[PDB]
C-alpha cells in the first residue's frame, strides 16, 4: 500500500520541520525580556454600559472611527453603538436570529454578519432612502459562519464551520478563492496590518497563516491542546496570539515558525473566547468563560489586571485603533467600554 | 450646530428604543425549540405535524406562538453550534426505536454540557410501529446491543395501549429508562426530561410539546420564587 508510505512520509517531514524549529531556539522570550521592568498594575474601569440587546451577544467589532461599534445578538438584531454618547444609531432586524459574528467595514459604509444560516449578509448603511437594507447575501458555505472581516468595501474573508475559509467578491457574490487545509471548524480569523495575509484558528488545535493574493497556506502553527476560539495579530504583523479551550494563550512568531510564550495560570481552567492586543502590543487582553477578562504582559507573561464587570460568559472583546478603550461583549446582553 | 447633532442621536435612539420594546413583546411571547434528531430517526414527520443551514416552522397552539428550529446543512461536529441554543425553551430530541447507543451518547453530552445545564429536553421515541413488529417477530433480538434488558422488567407506571402485546411494552419502557438513567444522574432541578412514545401516525405531538413547555415555564417560575 501507499497510504502508509504517505503516513510515514509526513512524519519524516514533521520531524524535519520540528528539528528546524529547535535549531532556531537559543534563548526563550522570558530570558530576553527578563531585564525590563514590569508594566505595574493596570486599573481599568467600566466607562460606559450598553443595555440595548435582548439576548446573548456573540460578537462585536469596533469601527475604524474608534467611536462607532457594531454588535450581534442572537435575538435577531444588529445594533450600532456610539461609544461616546451611548446612543443606538441603527437597529437592523436580521433574517435569521442565529448570528455568530459581526464585522464593521473600515470605511463605515457596510456591516457584515453570519451564523447558522451559512450566509454572510452585507448591510448597506448609506442607502438612497436613508434606511438600512440587506445589500448582498453570500451563499456557498456548507457550514455555519464563525467570523468575517472586510478587506475593503468589495472584498470580505469569512471562516465557516465547514473547515474552510473563503474570500468573496461582494460585487458578484461568488467566491474567488477557498482556503482549505483545516481539519475542524474554523472559529476565528485575524487580518494583518496589511491585507496580504491573515491567520485563522480552528477546532483542530492548529493555526494556519494564509496568503490572500495567492490563496495558499504558508505556515502552520501548533502547540495548543484544544480548539482555538480566538486569534489576533500583533500590531506590526510579525506575530500573533491565540485563545484556546485549554485555558492558555500563546504567542507565535511568523518568522520563527514557533511559539514564544504561554499565558496561563494554575487557577485558570476556563476557555478563552476572545483576544486582542493593545496599540503598543504590550497588553494581551483575553476574555474567559469565568465572566472575567484578564490583562497579560505580552513580554513577561505576567498578569497585570482583570476586567471583571460582566455577569455572564464574556463572548467578545476588542481594542480600538487608537487604543483608547476596550469594548467587551457578554452573554448577559450588555456591552461594557473599558478604559 | 453641535447640540442638534447631539439631539439627533438622542431622538433617533428614542425611536429605536420604541421599536425595541415592541420586538421585546413578541420575543418574550414566543418559545424557541430546537429539533435534534438522528440519521433516519423520523424527525421529518414531526415537522410535518404542522441549501438552507436551518429551517423554520411556526405554529400556534392555544393562542401561544412556538418557534421550532431544524438543523439544516451543518456538519456532524456539534460541539460549537450547539451552544447557540442555550436559551431555548426545550430541545425536542427524536430517537428511532449499535445505532441506539449513539443517540444515548448524544443525549448524554447534551444533558451534561456546561451551557445546556438549564435547558430541558423533550424526548420523542419515534418509530413505535417498527419497534412493535421486529420484537414480535424475534428475528434480531435487542439483547445483542443492550444485554441488561434480560434482567429488566416492566415498570410500575406502565400504561400500555389497549391491544398492545406485553412483550413490546417491555421493550419501549426499557429504551425510555435508558434515557431517564442519564437524565436522573445529573438533574439538580435545573432541567428535566419529558419522554413520549410517538409513532409516525400520532397527531397529538404538538399537544405534548404544549403540555411539557407549560411544565417548563411553571417550573421556571417556581424556581424564581424559590417555591420548587
Amino acid at each position, epitope marked *: 500500500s501507499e497510504l502508509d508510505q504517505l503516513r510515514q512520509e509526513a512524519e519524516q517531514l514533521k520531524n524535519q520541520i520540528r528539528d528546524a524549529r529547535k535549531a532556531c531556539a537559543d534563548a526563550t522570550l522570558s530570558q530576553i525580556t527578563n531585564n525590563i521592568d514590569p508594566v505595574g498594575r493596570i486599573q481599568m474601569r467600566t466607562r460606559r454600559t450598553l443595555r440595548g440587546h435582548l439576548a446573548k451577544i456573540y460578537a462585536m467589532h469596533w469601527g475604524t472611527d474608534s467611536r462607532l461599534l457594531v454588535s450581534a445578538s442572537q435575538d435577531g438584531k444588529l445594533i450600532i453603538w456610539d461609544s461616546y454618547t451611548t446612543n443606538k444609531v441603527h437597529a437592523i432586524p436580521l433574517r435569521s436570529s442565529w448570528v455568530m459574528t459581526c464585522a464593521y467595514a473600515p470605511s463605515g459604509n457596510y456591516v457584515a454578519c453570519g451564523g447558522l444560516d451559512n450566509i454572510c449578509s452585507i448591510y448597506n448603511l448609506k442607502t438612497r432612502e436613508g434606511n438600512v437594507r440587506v445589500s448582498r447575501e453570500l451563499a456557498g458555505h456548507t457550514g455555519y459562519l464563525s467570523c468575517c472581516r472586510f478587506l475593503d468595501d468589495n472584498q470580505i474573508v469569512t471562516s465557516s464551520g465547514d473547515t474552510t475559509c473563503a474570500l468573496w467578491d461582494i460585487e458578484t457574490g461568488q467566491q474567488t478563492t477557498t482556503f482549505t487545509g483545516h481539519t475542524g471548524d474554523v472559529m476565528s480569523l485575524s487580518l494583518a496590518p496589511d491585507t496580504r495575509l491573515f491567520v485563522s484558528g480552528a477546532c483542530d488545535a492548529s493555526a494556519k497563516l494564509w496568503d490572500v493574493r495567492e490563496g495558499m497556506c504558508r505556515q502552520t502553527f501548533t502547540g495548543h491542546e484544544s480548539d482555538i476560539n480566538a486569534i489576533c495579530f500583533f500590531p506590526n504583523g510579525n506575530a500573533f496570539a491565540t485563545g484556546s479551550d485549554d485555558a492558555t494563550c500563546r504567542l507565535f512568531d511568523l518568522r520563527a515558525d514557533q511559539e514564544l510564550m504561554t499565558y496561563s495560570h494554575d487557577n485558570i481552567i476556563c476557555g478563552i473566547t476572545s483576544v486582542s492586543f493593545s496599540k503598543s502590543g504590550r497588553l494581551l487582553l483575553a476574555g474567559y468563560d469565568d465572566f472575567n477578562c484578564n490583562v497579560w504582559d505580552a513580554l513577561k507573561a505576567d498578569r497585570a489586571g482583570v476586567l471583571a464587570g460582566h455577569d455572564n460568559r464574556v463572548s467578545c472583546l476588542g481594542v480600538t485603533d487608537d487604543g483608547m478603550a476596550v469594548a467587551t461583549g457578554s452573554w448577559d446582553s450588555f456591552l461594557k467600554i473599558w478604559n | 450646530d453641535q447640540r442638534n447633532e447631539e439631539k439627533a442621536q438622542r431622538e433617533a435612539n428614542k425611536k429605536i428604543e420604541k421599536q425595541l420594546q415592541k420586538d421585546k413583546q413578541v420575543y418574550r411571547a414566543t418559545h424557541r425549540l430546537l429539533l435534534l434528531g438522528a440519521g433516519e430517526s423520523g424527525k421529518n414527520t414531526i415537522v410535518k405535524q404542522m441549501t438552507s443551514g436551518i429551517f423554520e416552522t411556526k405554529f400556534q397552539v392555544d393562542k401561544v406562538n412556538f418557534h421550532m428550529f431544524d438543523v439544516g446543512a451543518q456538519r*456532524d461536529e456539534r460541539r460549537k453550534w450547539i451552544q447557540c441554543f442555550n436559551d431555548v425553551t426545550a430541545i425536542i430530541f427524536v430517537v428511532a426505536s449499535n445505532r441506539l447507543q449513539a443517540a444515548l451518547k448524544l443525549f448524554d453530552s447534551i444533558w451534561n454540557n456546561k451551557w445546556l445545564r438549564d435547558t430541558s429536553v423533550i424526548l420523542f421515541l419515534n418509530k413505535q410501529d417498527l419497534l412493535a413488529e421486529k420484537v414480535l417477530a424475534g428475528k434480531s433480538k435487542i439483547e445483542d446491543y443492550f444485554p441488561e434488558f434480560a434482567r429488566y422488567t416492566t415498570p410500575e407506571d406502565a400504561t400500555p395501549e389497549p391491544g398492545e402485546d406485553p412483550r413490546v411494552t417491555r421493550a419501549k419502557y426499557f429504551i425510555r429508562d435508558e434515557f431517564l438513567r442519564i437524565s436522573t444522574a445529573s438533574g439538580d432541578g435545573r432541567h428535566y426530561c419529558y419522554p413520549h412514545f410517538t409513532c409516525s401516525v400520532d397527531t397529538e405531538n404538538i399537544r405534548r410539546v404544549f403540555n411539557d413547555c407549560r411544565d417548563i415555564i411553571q417550573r421556571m417560575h417556581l424556581r424564581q420564587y424559590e417555591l420548587l
Partner: nanobody
Framework: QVQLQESGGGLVQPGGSLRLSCAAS????????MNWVRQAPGKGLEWVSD????????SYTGSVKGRFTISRDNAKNTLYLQMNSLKPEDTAVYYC?????????????????????RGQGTQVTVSS
C-alpha cells in the same frame, strides 16, 4: 501538537485476546477523558468505551460489556484496551479518541467521520 498513536493489534482467532495501546503526546493526558471508537467494514464509526480523567467513571457499549476493559496511566500518557473473548463480528479498525475540551463532563463528536483529536487507528481482524 496533539498526537495519538495506537499500538498493538493484528489478526486474531475467534475467542482470542488482544491488547491495544495508545501513546499520547502534545497535551496534558490527565485533564482529558479518553475514548475508544471503531469502524466496521461497510459501516460508520461506533463508540466502544470511555474512561474519566482519573479513571473512576468507566463505561462500555453493550455489545462488548464484560469482555473489554479500558485502563489508563496518567504518569505515562497511555491508554489501554484489553480485549477478551473476541468475536468475528468485532472486526474493525479501532481508533484512540480524546474528548475535545478538558475538565468537561460532556464529550462531543468523538464518533464523527472527521475528528482532529483521534489517532490513525489500528486494525483488528477476527477470522480464521
Amino acid at each position: 501538537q496533539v498526537q495519538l498513536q495506537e499500538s498493538g493489534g493484528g489478526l486474531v482467532q475467534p475467542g482470542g485476546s488482544l491488547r491495544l495501546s495508545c501513546a499520547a503526546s502534545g497535551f496534558t493526558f490527565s485533564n482529558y477523558k479518553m475514548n475508544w471508537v471503531r469502524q466496521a467494514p461497510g459501516k460508520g464509526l461506533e463508540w466502544v468505551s470511555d474512561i474519566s480523567q482519573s479513571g473512576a467513571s468507566i463505561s462500555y457499549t453493550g455489545s462488548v460489556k464484560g469482555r473489554f476493559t479500558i485502563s489508563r496511566d496518567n504518569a505515562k500518557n497511555t491508554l489501554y484496551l484489553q480485549m477478551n473473548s473476541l468475536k468475528p463480528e468485532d472486526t474493525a479498525v479501532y481508533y484512540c479518541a480524546r474528548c475535545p475540551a478538558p475538565f468537561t463532563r460532556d464529550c462531543f463528536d468523538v464518533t464523527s467521520t472527521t475528528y482532529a483529536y483521534r489517532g490513525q487507528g489500528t486494525q483488528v481482524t477476527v477470522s480464521s
